[PDB]
Paper text:
PHF13, also known as Survival time associated PHD finger in Ovarian Cancer 1 (SPOC1), is a chromatin affiliated protein that is conserved from zebra fish to humans. PHF13 has been shown to modulate various processes including development, DNA damage, cell cycle, antiviral host cell response and higher order chromatin structure, underlining its biological importance. PHF13 contains a single C-terminal PHD domain, which we demonstrate biochemically and structurally, is a molecular reader of H3K4me2/3. Similar to other PHD domains, the PHD domain of PHF13 folds into a canonical Cys4-His-Cys3 (or C4HC3) motif, that coordinates two zinc ions with a well-conserved globular domain.
Author numbering: 227 to 281
The structure:
C-alpha cells in the first residue's frame, strides 16, 4: 500500500491505488484516466501533455 497518499498527477489527487502511467520524458506518474487512456488500449510509450508542449 505504498505511496497511497502521494500526489504526483497534475489533477492534484493522490495515487489512491488507481491505475497510473509514467511519462517517458519527465518521469511523472499520471493517473491512467487523467492521461485519457482507456484500460483496453494502453500505449507502450506515454508522453504527458506538458512534455508534448515543451518550450
Ligand atoms: Zn490525475
Ligand atoms: Zn512529461
Amino acid at each position: 500500500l505504498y505511496f497511497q497518499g502521494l500526489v504526483t498527477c497534475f489533477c492534484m489527487k493522490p495515487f489512491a491505488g488507481r491505475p497510473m502511467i509514467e511519462c517517458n520524458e519527465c518521469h511523472t506518474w499520471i493517473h491512467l484516466s487523467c492521461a485519457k487512456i482507456r484500460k483496453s488500449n494502453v500505449p507502450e510509450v506515454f508522453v504527458c501533455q506538458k512534455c508534448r508542449d515543451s518550450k
